[PDB]
């Protein structure tokens, strides 16, 4: 595949913006200081600022002396340039308002979707570019208290389910400060207090502190009403950026970062590449300044050959090997396709039987239930003589939407599973079910040694085969089978590729305390042949500082693997994580580098960045010294592809770090590692699964080391 030119969401900045004289200093924080002083922050800890104006701050500061722009490291030049763009009126506040002139806030139910732009500066080859990235916030139109019908229980019920993404904006504050509710460490239990004295004080705090006038007070009571002493106070910390604030549900509205996370809404937040291109152009043409280009930049990208997309194949019982990418007399049979695995966990050799549960959501239409039971029966058949092509059925119907039905389901299954090692559940559920109810049904069935596979009403009504409405699309069937097999540790595919590593390891850092545990994170391992072989928990001691002893974390990784039948000693590994490899993580990796003579290759894998290429095709390009890679297209879903950002690569030998450079080879490694999705209806497989597992541990999933020892993705 040749190259191509694609437009990106960057607009070149005029060098005339670069400051004449910069003043340095040493020590409404240090950041606000610099900011108000039209300057930035050179050194975090040392408290070192760099302003472009004479610092006004009668305080503990030492004037180090003027500095020239060329002296600041790139990051600071860019950060400094950013601050300077703001002074010329080019900032998120302003451009977000311009955006909303063409893309207005839309209300859905009790929620409002608010468009705005996220701005940053990127220095690319001696030049600075402003990245303007369109984003959305989903803010509730009703206060949290109103939203939960002023019921204490229903309230605690809210903070719990939405715990992972919930934010609360104090609409009663002139600053509209956003907060994050606090939760009792290692629990879904939100920090609360029904002490009316706390409620009164803080409700009163607002009026006294911001609406001290009669009209203002009128407005306040008109808007918020009296103090509902029946509401508990919610303990919280700022979301921005150890210190806790009290929030009153009656005065806070729940908010969410759309991108960080409902059909309706989703159809509004997803924008086509041309829609983003256009909206940015509309904003630019509304920007009154030649301090930035009038048009979006174009860059040369490397297209990714379609061949590199067929290196993963599956085969049938005959000799038919085909790349995971998709008349005969038998095409009338509902029989699921046949897949001949390349490897099957040795566990299935001893195992006697395997109970098969068909759990039907009673809320689904009878014909939908009937359809699902037939689909699953066919799936189980292919499931079998797939698990042993190289060498019982209980139907449960309950209201999967009520807590009472989920209980009866788990009990009825528990009943049949007593005495058995492994069980399987095929569940048909209405789309109404929350993630929570799905996660609970799944986790509760696993405590009973039952792996499960959910198929929702949607898939059942819009994915039928063109020639047989009483059968699922061949595409979907294959993917259902791949999912189940992956959940069972089956190597059902083969990769025409070899990683130049011993093992590729994805780690996740996430503190959790488990009944006899106290776990700091997770790690998942893939061999050079591209298969998942080990999924381990990473237990640690009660951490000292407010950080995590990564040295202990990584040392336990090796030890825990050595215990799982894998010794990383004198081996070369590619270690990845979700995000930038932090300093502590680097040191931790150097430590484990000498202590076991391990050649560690690592780099930043960033999925949360604003750079966007307004083209829907596989590609990669160098921008600002980092690599941006779009591993796959989009065929059904609306939207703009999100690149995976690759950067700050290093090699670690005997505790020594050698900053490196990313090669087309590295990009190919992430690419293939990313192509491994296991038929899921964005991140490299290793990293993605470490995260799913770190999530399973924090949700109380049982930890079957028998299963994880052979890569069962039973929690995924």
Swiss-Prot record:
Activity regulation summary: Inhibited at greater than 500 mM NaCl.
The name this protein goes by in its record: Protein argonaute
Cofactor remark from the record: Probably binds 2 Mn(2+) per subunit; only 1 is seen in the structure. Mn(2+) is the preferred cation for cleavage, Co(2+) can be used but not Mg(2+), Ca(2+), Cu(2+), Fe(2+) or Ni(2+).
Binding sites annotated in the UniProt record for Mn(2+) 3: 716
Primary role: A DNA-guided ssDNA endonuclease that may play a role in defense against invading mobile genetic elements. Uses short 5'-phospho-ssDNA sequences as guides (gDNA) to bind complementary target strands, resulting in cleavage of the target DNA (tDNA). Endonucleolytically cleaves DNA in short dsDNA (the gDNA indicates where to cleave on the tDNA). Efficient guide-dependent target DNA cleavage requires a minimal gDNA length of 15 nucleotides (nt) and works up to at least 31 nt. Overexpression decreases plasmid transformation efficiency. Has no appreciable activity with gRNA or on target RNA.
Annotated region described as Mid domain, given as residue ranges: 334-494
Thermal properties of activity per the entry: Optimum temperature is 87-99.9 degrees Celsius, has very low activity at 37 degrees Celsius after 16 hours.
Observed phenotype of the null mutant: 2-fold increased plasmid transformation efficiency.
Residues that bind Mn(2+) 1: 508, 578, 691
PAZ domain span: 143-256
GO molecular function: DNA binding; DNA endonuclease activity; manganese ion binding; RNA binding
Keyword Transit peptide: no
Active site feature: 508, 546, 578, 691
Enzyme class label: hydrolase
Stretches for region Interdomain connector: 260-333
């Amino acid at each position: 595949s040749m190259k191509a030119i694609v437009v990106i969401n960057l607009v070149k900045i005029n060098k005339k913006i670069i400051p004449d004289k910069i003043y340095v200093y040493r020590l409404y924080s240090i950041y606000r200081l610099a900011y108000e002083n039209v300057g930035i922050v050179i050194d975090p800890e040392n408290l070192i600022i760099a302003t472009t104006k004479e610092l006004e701050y009668e305080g503990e500061f030492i004037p180090e002396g003027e500095i020239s722009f060329s002296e600041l490291r790139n990051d600071y030049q860019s950060k400094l340039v950013l601050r300077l763009l703001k002074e010329n009126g080019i900032g998120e506040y302003e451009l977000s308002k311009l955006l909303r002139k063409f893309r207005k806030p839309k209300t859905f139910g009790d929620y409002k979707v608010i468009p705005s732009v996220e701005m940053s500066v990127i220095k690319h080859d001696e030049d600075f570019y402003l990245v303007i990235h369109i984003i959305h916030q989903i803010q509730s139109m009703k206060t949290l208290w109103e939203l939960v019908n002023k019921d204490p229980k229903e309230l605690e019920e809210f903070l719990m389910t939405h715990k992972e993404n919930l934010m609360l904006k104090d609409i009663a504050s002139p600053l509209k400060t956003v907060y994050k509710p606090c939760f009792e460490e290692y629990t879904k239990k939100p920090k609360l207090d029904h002490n009316q004295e706390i409620v009164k004080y803080w409700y009163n705090y607002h009026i006294e502190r911001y609406w001290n006038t009669p009209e203002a007070k009128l407005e306040f009571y008109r808007k918020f009403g009296q103090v509902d002493l029946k509401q508990p106070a919610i303990l919280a910390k700022f979301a921005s950026k150890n210190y806790k604030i009290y929030l009153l549900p009656q005065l806070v509205v729940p908010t969410y970062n759309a991108e960080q996370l409902a059909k309706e809404i989703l159809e509004y937040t997803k924008l086509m590449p041309e829609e983003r291109k256009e909206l940015l152009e509309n904003i630019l043409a509304e920007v009154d300044s030649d301090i930035i280009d009038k048009s979006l930049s174009e860059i040369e990208v490397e297209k990714i050959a379609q061949e590199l997309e067929n290196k993963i194949r599956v085969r049938d019982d005959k000799g038919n090997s085909v790349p995971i990418s998709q008349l005969l007399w038998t095409n009338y049979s509902r029989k699921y396709p046949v897949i001949l695995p390349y490897e099957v966990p040795e566990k299935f050799r001893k195992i006697r039987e395997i109970p098969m549960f068909i759990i039907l959501d009673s809320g689904l239409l009878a014909d939908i239930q009937n359809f699902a039971t037939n689909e699953f029966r066919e799936l189980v058949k292919s499931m079998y003589y797939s698990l042993a092509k190289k060498y019982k059925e209980k139907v449960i119907t309950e209201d999967l939407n009520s807590d009472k039905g989920i209980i009866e389901v788990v009990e009825q299954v528990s009943s049949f599973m007593k005495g058995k090692e492994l069980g399987l559940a095929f569940i048909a559920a209405r789309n109404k079910l929350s993630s929570e109810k799905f996660e609970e049904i799944k986790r509760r069935l696993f405590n009973l040694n039952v792996i499960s596979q959910v198929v929702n009403e949607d898939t059942l009504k819009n994915k039928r085969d063109k020639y047989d409405r009483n059968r699922l699309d061949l595409f979907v069937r294959h993917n259902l089978l791949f999912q189940v097999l992956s959940k069972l540790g089956v190597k059902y595919y083969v990769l025409d590729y070899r990683f130049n590593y011993d093992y590729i390891i994805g780690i996740d850092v996430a503190p959790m305390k488990r009944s006899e545990g106290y776990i700091g994170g997770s790690a998942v391992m893939f061999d050079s042949q591209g298969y998942i072989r080990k999924i381990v928990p990473i237990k640690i001691g009660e951490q000292r500082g407010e950080s995590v002893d990564m040295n202990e974390f990584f040392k336990e990784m090796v030890d825990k693997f050595k215990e799982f039948n894998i010794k990383l000693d004198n081996k070369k590994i590619l270690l990845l994580r979700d995000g930038r490899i932090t300093n502590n993580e680097e040191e931790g990796l150097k430590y484990i580098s000498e202590m076991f003579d391990i050649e560690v290759v690592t780099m930043d894998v960033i999925k949360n960045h604003p750079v966007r290429a307004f083209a829907n095709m596989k590609m990669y390009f160098n921008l600002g010294g980092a690599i941006y890679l779009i591993p796959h297209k989009l065929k059904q879903a609306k939207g703009t592809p999100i690149p995976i950002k690759l950067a700050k690569k290093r090699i670690i030998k005997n505790g020594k770090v050698e900053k490196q450079s990313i090669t087309r080879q590295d990009v190919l490694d992430i690419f293939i590692l990313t192509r491994l999705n296991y038929g899921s209806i964005r991140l490299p497989a290793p990293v993605h699964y470490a995260h799913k597992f770190a999530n399973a541990i924090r949700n109380e999933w049982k930890i079957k080391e028998e299963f994880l020892a052979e890569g069962f993705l039973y929690f995924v």
